[PDB]
């Protein structure tokens, strides 16, 4: 049966994980994806004590709701391509800490953000520094035996499965894999269905959200350009058996749980249509 | 860093995992590989309670000594190729329970036994049943996001990297990888150094021991046909950045602790001559 998860930032903001995990179970999800983003509050998770780490493991084992993956979007703030050597070193230290964290709490996959730089302008130097930082991250990941899976991004350097496969070929490492976002993939000039089929033996997780050209965030399900039934059809037929994660940001909604319930039923209807 | 690890059965027996991990720490090992073999005793680990599983996580985090991998030799007794449907079901159940155990406890890689059958003679039907059992196993691993790694075996069906690569290509799944034993890879008529280069983007871990033509188990370090310095050179030059696990049964043989320290330094000496 198909594992279905919810993004952390879809649910109420608390740092009590047992409550967060119990809520996910109640809403019918098998898992939660943790965000380690640009904010200092989530960034501080990497400096958690042994007891804070073991408390998360406790809540997981007790509720049965897994935290198999981490979204590492902190690299938008501290990119690995930064020609500011201080910022780049901060980005690699965050990579090191996310992997140790992953080891500590049994996170299966760290989703990488494919930005060479975000708030600054890319050039050849940012692309070379990003590539080297990726090799270095993947080396750390080989030692720890932790999967780093590159997201297909809201950003041209990594805006297709083909571009992620380029990096995968260059790296040639079993611990570097693919985590496509079917929304991000659908908002450029890609052949989406061929891209999905092309990545198959590299795809470890799928992000599920709607988008429009140039709009990658908070676009409501059904109001964008993503052909969900087609994407699930292709993935199923091509032999994909991994998890799907509903990505939304309803932490700011009046009733986060009610929004998540509606999004879950909407996504599930389309999975069912496509044979799953 | 080269992560160096020690097989469970190279250390004194029992179920206090805290003491064992502590022992491996003072001996200078980064990690311990757990065994889930043919004994009811070790199989009952798959039936541990949430509390037993948590106590193991606690000890790992306390000591800093990881348990990143599991040797799953239990399939010799309950093979996936068995023409006895009841024996086959048991092996599949074991596979399922091992994946969940790996989830609960944060094990990175489950090392699979590459035998269609072991105590019976193989035929087209056992090969077929083993093939479909593997596929079922890999689908379970994809949902859970747990790596299953095929060991290079003391058995003709999987006696090279090439054989494991054949299965890897057939399965075309990121959760099926490769776990070469350089002893077993050397105990046949293989081109060893070619094999290790061939498998490189699939190799997640490496078993280190010594063997002879025909003889597979416990030949002391240096007395077999394994060219350690050359194997370590091939892997170093090819871009391997993963762990090495020293396979020993010291738990029997004289002063177990003093034997693993000799073999630890013997392995490290061979690695250092190879550029490492
Ligand atoms: Zn490929
Ligand atoms: Zn996404
Ligand atoms: Zn291959
Ligand atoms: Zn071995």
Swiss-Prot record, chains A, B:
Induction: Induced by L-ascorbate. Repressed by UlaR. Its EC number is 5.1.3.22. InterPro entries: L-Ru-5P_3-Epase, L-Ru-5P_3-Epase_Enterobacteria, Sugar_Epim/Isomerase, Xyl_isomerase-like_sf, Xyl_isomerase-like_TIM-brl. Pathway: Cofactor degradation; L-ascorbate degradation; D-xylulose 5-phosphate from L-ascorbate: step 3/4. The keyword Isomerase applies. GO terms for biological process: L-ascorbic acid catabolic process. It catalyses: L-ribulose 5-phosphate = L-xylulose 5-phosphate. Keywords: Isomerase. It is an enzyme of class 5 (isomerase). GO terms for molecular function: intramolecular oxidoreductase activity, interconverting aldoses and ketoses; L-ribulose-5-phosphate 3-epimerase activity. Catalyzes the isomerization of L-xylulose-5-phosphate to L-ribulose-5-phosphate. Is involved in the anaerobic L-ascorbate utilization. NCBIfam families: hxl6Piso_put, PRK13209.1, PRK13210.1. Belongs to the L-ribulose-5-phosphate 3-epimerase family. This is L-ribulose-5-phosphate 3-epimerase UlaE. It comes from Escherichia coli O157:H7.
């Amino acid at each position: 049966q198909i594992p279905l998860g919810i993004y952390e930032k879809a649910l109420p903001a608390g740092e009590c994980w047992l409550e967060r995990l119990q809520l996910a179970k109640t809403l019918g999800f098998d898992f939660v994806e943790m965000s380690v983003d640009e904010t200092d509050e989530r960034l501080s998770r990497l400096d958690w004590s042994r007891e804070q780490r073991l408390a998360l493991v406790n809540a997981i084992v007790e509720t049965g709701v897994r935290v198999p993956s981490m979204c590492l979007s902190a690299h938008r703030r501290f990119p690995l391509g930064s020609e500011d050597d201080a910022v780049r070193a901060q980005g690699l230290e965050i990579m090191r800490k996310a992997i140790q964290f992953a080891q500590d709490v049994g996170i299966r996959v760290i989703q990488l953000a494919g930005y060479d730089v975000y708030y600054q302008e890319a050039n050849n130097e940012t692309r070379r520094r990003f590539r080297d930082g990726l090799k270095e991250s993947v080396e750390m990941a080989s030692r720890a035996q932790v999967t780093l899976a590159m997201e297909i991004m809201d950003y041209p350097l990594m805006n297709s499965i083909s571009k992620a496969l380029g990096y995968a070929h260059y790296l040639n490492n079993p611990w570097f894999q693919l985590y496509p976002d079917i929304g991000n993939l659908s908002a450029w000039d890609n052949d989406v269905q061929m891209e999905l089929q092309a990545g198959i033996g590299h795809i470890v997780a799928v992000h599920v959200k709607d988008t429009k050209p140039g709009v990658f965030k908070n676009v409501p399900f059904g109001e964008g350009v993503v052909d969900f039934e087609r994407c699930f059809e292709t993935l199923k037929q091509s032999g994909y058996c991994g998890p799907y994660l509903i990505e939304m940001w309803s932490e700011t909604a009046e009733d986060p749980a009610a929004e998540v319930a509606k999004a879950r039923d909407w996504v599930k209807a389309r999975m069912a249509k496509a044979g799953m």
